[PDB]
């Protein structure tokens, strides 16, 4: 077995190669239809049952389209639904730019929309403008593009996070300079609701915001809004009504201020950021309520800002984070999912509007308002759970209509019982609490807890329900079923399932095996759409009609109705990887992907590149098309590199115990799994040259790339670390404390997990360590690299470095990505793959 040495191209030739191969992947990199919604035609004579609305990209911008769902189909042929544009043609700020980092939005245009069923009113942001159109309500259905109607404003700055009032579709709310405003889209009345922030002041002396999710909640809990409309209006005797907005008010005064380099490099300046680093203060939080009195003809009479009767820290003992919030369907209670600092205790807490009283600096008039609120009105902890690993926040929470006065019925999901995420139907009793506010004491920990009358497991087994990144449930309250996504058939594939929530038993899979599926179920529960792919085939989007057999409504079947997006088709350059697996000495089956070198010569061994992420909340190895985002792994295979990817312990879609393997110990176990899987492949496949292994990853992947070179220089010849964490004390509260705890309670884990404290352990040979980092990174600060370099210089160790001066924790400018790919490919050539690379040692 002699070594294969890759073709040694020049910098200009590699640029040409990469440019040519990028030229046939413009149509691949295009957003599939998403954010689907079904609206019934209610037209017996007409040929269509439903109209579906969705966001899609027809290099075009993201916009609203509709398609017509027929009542009947020609089952011989395949129906391709034509895309009708909903909107006519039209005539970034810092906060848009940051939100797009926090939401991980790579695409341009309309990101989302609201819809009010009763009126047909769409509300959506498009650039700076907030816009509305009407379709599918009492006013009927358009047969041509609608003109977007601008919501006019006197506000000077960007309006963010617009939401339609479900109680009245004439009203919207939005955030402007970190305060809540409302606007009427008919009358054009505009009103500021909160006076908490001053646009003219400096952030160093102006740290309060309202209706806004702060950095940690956007980055670590995927919560981007901080205010929630009450879904129902209270009628007044006058003939008007009261609209309500629950909102979060944040005070970031005690949160540390860091400086991130300003994008305009010519200014030689730096922007201030409230960044809660691990073990330091998170923002001081509380709930508030805006009470908005409207008259008979829609004009604002008054606005009363209201606060909790007692402090947040008293009423919600031990709570750091408001993870989620909303309202019950009738608007009687506001709900909230609350976490403690360690993120090992979750609480679902109902909050009545009667807990809020008007804001009053006058101590006399305030004391009258406190005593006017009854002692029976109190917070109701309807659910509480704990874990020795961590609470993974998700978006599953369904509240049923309130049937009895002193009961609430709901579906929630949890990993706390069995160690896998399953659905549970829960019924909680809303007792009058033991704590009485008149007595003048403080409430004990358990005084707001509700008794659990019923707790039925809807699903179970060694597999999880999916509740993140769009995955959710859909409840059919008529047939008493719940649709959900899960890993029951395979950890490598997501599938749509259905089950009864009254007498749970049979779980019916509604999607076909051999693909992974991301699904949307119609609100009417008679259709679902699946965005699906596999390792060989690019993503497709298809509509499926649901129905029951005549004899049994419980049982659910499906039938292909139409294609929304057809597969682009197998690309001739692209050879996909093979999924492999191996029984680890740790007791788990670990999955991987193998890209064999193209035109594999027998009796020859090839240089290997281990692409790695290896961190929580991600699974790289599954049955999906990897020819868009990981197209360059195939490019590496086409030049003669073996490419390997392994999902080590700690990765997701394998239950909480598997994910919990690296608790307190991040960086210590991951490379063992990677090397084990890499050694499994080498004994099985003699074409893997273990003398020439490279490792490469971004963020957590870059972190592990450094850990690999530090811990196992015997295995890994080169390490290319992209935007790595080199020091856990620099990273934030929400992430670090969840996985690693407080720094003082894990001194050794923080030490061992921080490569910058262990600079002496890196190799004394050069051409083995390449650091890459976006200069403007506000997530993984450039100081991770700068401080690592500082200690490498002190320890006499060599390094290579590439900065991307226009980038944050992402690559958005095309030239940056092109340079990165070019430099990486050239680095691997000169220091791992090529013939000159072998001579260089």
């Amino acid at each position: 077995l002699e070594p294969f040495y890759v073709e040694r191209y020049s910098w200009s030739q590699l640029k040409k190669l990469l440019a040519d191969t990028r030229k046939y992947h413009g149509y691949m990199m295009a957003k599939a239809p998403h954010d689907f919604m079904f609206v019934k035609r209610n037209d017996p004579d007409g040929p269509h049952s439903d109209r579906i609305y969705y966001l899609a990209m027809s290099n075009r911008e993201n916009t609203l389209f509709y398609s017509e769902i027929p009542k009947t189909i020609n089952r011989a042929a395949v129906l391709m639904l034509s895309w009708k544009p909903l909107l006519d043609l039209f005539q970034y700020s810092r906060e848009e730019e940051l939100l797009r980092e926090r939401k991980r939005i790579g695409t341009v245009g309309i990101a989302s929309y609201d819809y009010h069923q009763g009126s047909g009113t769409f509300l959506f942001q498009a650039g700076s403008g907030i816009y509305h159109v009407k379709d599918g309500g009492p006013q009927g259905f358009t047969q041509q593009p609608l003109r977007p109607n601008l919501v006019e404003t006197s506000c000077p700055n960007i309006r963010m996070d617009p939401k339609l009032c479900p109680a009245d579709p004439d009203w919207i709310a939005f955030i402007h300079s970190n305060d809540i405003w409302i606007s009427n889209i008919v009358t054009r009345e505009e009103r500021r609701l909160t006076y908490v922030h001053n646009e003219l002041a400096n952030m160093e002396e102006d740290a309060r915001s309202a209706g806004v999710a702060t950095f940690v909640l956007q980055e670590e809990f995927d919560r981007y809004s901080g205010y929630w409309w009450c879904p129902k209006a209270e009628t007044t005797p006058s003939g008007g009504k009261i609209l309500r907005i629950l909102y979060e008010e944040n005070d970031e005064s005690e949160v540390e201020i860091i400086h991130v380099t300003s994008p305009m490099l010519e200014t030689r300046r730096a922007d201030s950021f409230r960044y809660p680093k691990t073990g330091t203060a998170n923002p001081k939080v509380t709930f508030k309520m805006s009470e908005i009195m409207i008259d008979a003809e829609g004009r604002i009479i008054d606005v009363i800002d209201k606060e909790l009767i007692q402090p947040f820290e008293i009423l919600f003992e031990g709570v750091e984070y408001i993870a989620r919030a909303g309202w019950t369907p009738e608007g009687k209670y506001a709900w909230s999912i609350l976490l403690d600092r360690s993120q090992t205790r979750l609480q679902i807490v109902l909050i009545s509007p009667e807990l809020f009283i008007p804001v009053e600096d006058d101590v006399m008039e305030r004391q009258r308002l406190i005593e006017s609120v009854p002692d029976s009105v109190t917070p109701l902890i309807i659910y509480e759970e704990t874990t020795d690993i961590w609470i993974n926040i998700h978006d599953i929470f369904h509240v049923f209509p309130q049937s009895h006065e002193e009961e609430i019925e709901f579906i929630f999901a949890s990993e706390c019982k069995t160690g896998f995420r399953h659905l549970y139907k829960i019924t909680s009793i809303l007792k009058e609490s033991k704590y009485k506010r008149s007595s003048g004491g403080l409430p004990a920990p358990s005084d707001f807890k509700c008794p659990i009358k019923e707790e039925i497991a809807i699903t179970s087994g060694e597999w999880e329900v999916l509740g993140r990144h769009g995955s959710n449930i859909q409840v059919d309250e008529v047939r008493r079923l719940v649709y959900f996504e899960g890993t029951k058939d395979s950890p490598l594939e997501h599938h749509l399932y259905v089950v009864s929530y009254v007498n749970p038993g049979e779980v019916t899979r509604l999607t076909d095996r051999g693909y992974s599926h991301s699904c949307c179920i119609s609100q009417h529960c008679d259709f679902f759409i699946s965005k699906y792919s596999n390792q060989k085939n690019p993503h497709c989007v298809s509509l499926y009609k649901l129905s029951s057999p005549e004899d049994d409504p419980t049982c659910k079947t499906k039938e292909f109705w139409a294609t929304i997006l057809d597969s682009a088709g197998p690309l001739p350059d692209y050879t996909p990887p093979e999924i492999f697996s191996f029984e680890s000495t740790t007791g788990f089956t670990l999955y991987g992907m193998l890209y064999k070198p193209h035109d594999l010569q027998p009796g020859k061994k090839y240089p290997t590149v281990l692409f790695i992420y290896g961190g929580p909340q991600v699974q790289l190895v599954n049955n999906r098309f990897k020819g868009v985002k990981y197209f360059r792994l195939n490019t590496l295979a086409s030049l003669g590199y073996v490419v390997v990817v392994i999902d080590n312990r700690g990765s997701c879609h394998r239950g909480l115990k598997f994910e919990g393997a690296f608790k307190y110990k991040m960086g210590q176990i991951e490379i063992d799994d990677q090397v084990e899987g890499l050694q499994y492949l080498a004994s099985r496949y003699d074409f893997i040259d273990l003398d020439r292994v490279g490792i490469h990853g971004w963020s957590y992947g870059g972190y592990l790339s450094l850990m690999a070179l530090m811990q196992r220089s015997d295995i890994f010849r080169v390490a290319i670390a992209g935007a790595p964490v080199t020091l856990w004390i620099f990273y934030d509260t929400g992430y670090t404390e969840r996985y690693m705890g407080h720094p003082d309670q894990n001194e050794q884990g923080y030490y061992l997990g921080s490569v910058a404290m262990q600079a002496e352990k890196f190799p004394s040979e050069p051409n083995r360590l390449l650091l890459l980092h976006g200069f403007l990174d506000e997530n993984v600060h450039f100081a991770h690299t700068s401080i690592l370099l500082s200690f490498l210089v002190r320890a006499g160790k060599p390094y290579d470095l590439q900065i991307y001066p226009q980038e944050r924790h992402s690559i958005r400018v095309p030239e940056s990505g092109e340079h990165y790919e070019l430099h990486l490919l050239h680095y691997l050539q000169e220091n791992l793959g090529s013939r000159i690379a072998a001579l260089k040692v």
Binding site: K629, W698, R812
Partner: peptide, 8 residues
């Protein structure tokens, strides 16, 4: 999240 974004 220690999760980078690059789509090409």
């Amino acid at each position: 999240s220690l999760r980078f974004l690059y789509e090409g």
